[PDB]
Amino acid sequence: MLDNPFIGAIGYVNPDWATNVISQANQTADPTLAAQMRKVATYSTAVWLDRIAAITAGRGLRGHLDEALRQMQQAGQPVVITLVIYDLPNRDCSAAASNGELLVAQNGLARYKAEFIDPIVAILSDPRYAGLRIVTIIEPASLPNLVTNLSIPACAEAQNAYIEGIRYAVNRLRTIPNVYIYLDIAHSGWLGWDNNFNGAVNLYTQVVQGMDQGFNSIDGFITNVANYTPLEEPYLPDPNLTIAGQPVRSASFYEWNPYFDELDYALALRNAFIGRGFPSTIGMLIDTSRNGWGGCSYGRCRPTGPSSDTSSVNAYVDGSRVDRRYHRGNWCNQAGGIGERPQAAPRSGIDAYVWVKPPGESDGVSQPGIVDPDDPNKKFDPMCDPNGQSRYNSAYPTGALPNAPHAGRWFPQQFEILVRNAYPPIQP
Ligand SMILES: OC[C@H]1O[C@@H](O[C@H]2[C@H](O)[C@@H](O)[C@H](O[C@H]3[C@H](O)[C@@H](O)[C@H](O[C@H]4[C@H](O)[C@@H](O)[C@H](O[C@H]5[C@H](O)[C@@H](O)[C@H](O[C@H]6[C@H](O)[C@@H](O)[C@H](O[C@H]7[C@H](O)[C@@H](O)[C@H](O)O[C@@H]7CO)O[C@@H]6CO)O[C@@H]5CO)O[C@@H]4CO)O[C@@H]3CO)O[C@@H]2CO)[C@H](O)[C@@H](O)[C@@H]1O
Ligand SMILES: [Mg+2]
Numbered sequence: 001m002l003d004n005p006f007i008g009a010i011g012y013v014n015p016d017w018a019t020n021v022i023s024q025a026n027q028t029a030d031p032t033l034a035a036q037m038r039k040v041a042t043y044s045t046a047v048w049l050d051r052i053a054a055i056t057a058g059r060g061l062r063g064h065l066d067e068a069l070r071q072m073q074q075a076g077q078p079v080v081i082t083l084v085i086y087d088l089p090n091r092d093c094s095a096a097a098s099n100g101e102l103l104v105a106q107n108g109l110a111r112y113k114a115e116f117i118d119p120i121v122a123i124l125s126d127p128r129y130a131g132l133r134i135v136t137i138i139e140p141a142s143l144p145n146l147v148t149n150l151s152i153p154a155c156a157e158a159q160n161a162y163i164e165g166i167r168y169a170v171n172r173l174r175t176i177p178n179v180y181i182y183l184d185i186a187h188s189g190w191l192g193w194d195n196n197f198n199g200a201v202n203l204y205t206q207v208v209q210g211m212d213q214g215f216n217s218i219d220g221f222i223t224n225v226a227n228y229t230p231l232e233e234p235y236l237p238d239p240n241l242t243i244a245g246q247p248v249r250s251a252s253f254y255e256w257n258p259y260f261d262e263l264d265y266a267l268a269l270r271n272a273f274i275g276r277g278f279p280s281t282i283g284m285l286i287d288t289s290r291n292g293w294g295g296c297s298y299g300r301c302r303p304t305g306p307s308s309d310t311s312s313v314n315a316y317v318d319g320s321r322v323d324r325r326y327h328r329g330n331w332c333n334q335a336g337g338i339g340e341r342p343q344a345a346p347r348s349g350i351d352a353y354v355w356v357k358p359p360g361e362s363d364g365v366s367q368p369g370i371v372d373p374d375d376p377n378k379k380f381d382p383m384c385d386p387n388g389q390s391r392y393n394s395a396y397p398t399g400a401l402p403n404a405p406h407a408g409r410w411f412p413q414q415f416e417i418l419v420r421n422a423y424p425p426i427q428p
């Protein structure tokens with residue numbers, strides 16, 4: 001095992017994702033924007049194993065690991081390909097747009113180990129792929145739900161399936177010696193608050209303390225998967241800066257959460273886990289696929305500096321935050337923009353920026369009454385209603401875009417926004 005699988009290697013370029021990118025660029029009138037989409041098609045996105053069919057459907061997990069070898073020989077350097085292990089029973093328990101095919105009360109935990117994990121680790125140990133670095137991101141939006149959403153019965157039912165299921169997946173993956181294991185730990189707009197933060201460091205510690213190799217079973221964590229939270233709020237650098245006689249962490253957008261951006265958040269988690277037993281070799285990944293926040297949307301443009309308005313912390317922070325979402329929990333089909341491009345070791349503690357959620361794939365269907373044949377449990381969630389209000393705080397619009405298909409399907413109108421709003425902007 002290396003300490004950074006992303007150093008000294010190039011990123012796998014999933015051709016099935018780029019097919020959707022290029023075939024839309026072929027359909028895009030504007031010549032400048034179409035050139036940008038062709039450039040976006042060259043970057044490294046992750047490969048989501050989101051159902052048991054995904055192991056075999058199309059080129060399959062095999063064909064991706066095979067295609068990765070084609071790109072390793074072709075380039076001379078090694079290739080790091082990013083797989084997302086995403087099919088726990090009772091999946092996405094606190095929402096409805098990504099409910100999985102396995103569920104606990106239908107012998108789901110047993111099906112998870114037997115039909116999904118086992119065949120994956122089988123393919124992953126074929127010695128033909130020992131020359132790749134295989135990063136495996138373990139079940140986004142799983143353990144975080146057990147910290148803030150156990151009052152919800154769907155998660156409460158699934159705690160053991162999550163722990164036993166995540167432990168089983170990581171134990172059987174540590175045997176493959178070129179797979180690097182990253183546990184998802186959500187984002188700062190979820191676990192930033194003090195008791196949410198502290199509750200996650202306590203839950204995650206025992207989850208891995210019970211793994212086969214203990215604190216050595218994982219290589220780090222990943223944050224901001226499939227979300228829009230920025231790398232850095234540059235014009236709100238200090239959450240304790242007193243404006244109008246109040247610290248600006250008290251603004252209604254943050255509600256006393258001290259972690260405004262994912263860089264402050266991820267590094268805080270890394271120091272916390274280190275001081276509780278984890279080796280200093282752990283590193284955090286940050287999904288930067290849709291957190292650039294360039295362009296203009298939601299009635300605002302990207303700030304070029306702190307706002308002249310010192311009247312309130314609310315007027316100050318709202319005018320200084322790169323994140324323009326009406327409410328920080330607005331997680332669905334947001335009109336953001338592509339963020340930092342995938343790059344290795346951008347700063348101490350961060351292993352690499354990655355694109356885990358592929359730009360262009362939807363977060364959820366935007367109207368009720370539609371069934372996806374391939375994901376029969378994905379449903380309409382009010383957070384994606386383009387005319388609705390957030391179900392976490394009713395006072396704010398969801399901000400979700402309309403005409404969105406079920407989560408995972410290609411969203412051509414959000415992709416155009418994500419490209420136009422990219423920061424750093426797409427250079428053709
Ligand atoms: O085959 C087709 C193709 O399939 C492809 O793959 C797809 C795959 O199929 C998809 O399913 C997959 O999807 C992802 C979506 O893209 C994500 O958007 C989505 O994840 C959501 C999840 O649904 C949602 O439940 C979750 O919610 C969080 C939210 O992020 C967070 O902001 C919020 O925070 C709360 C917090 O919890 C509270 O504690 C908090 O409290 C404070 C309070 O406000 C304050 O008043 C008080 O003072 O203090 C309190 C603190 O104590 O409030 C906050 C509210 O702001 O909490 C929510 C949970 O409750 O968010 C996630 C996203 O972050 O779901 C999935 C997984 O992420 O994507 C893949 C790829 O696209 C294949 O690729 C392709 O090949 C196929 O063709
Ligand atoms: Mg490391």
Ligand SMILES: [Mg+2]
Nearest residue numbers: 233237261264
């Ligand atoms: Mg900061």
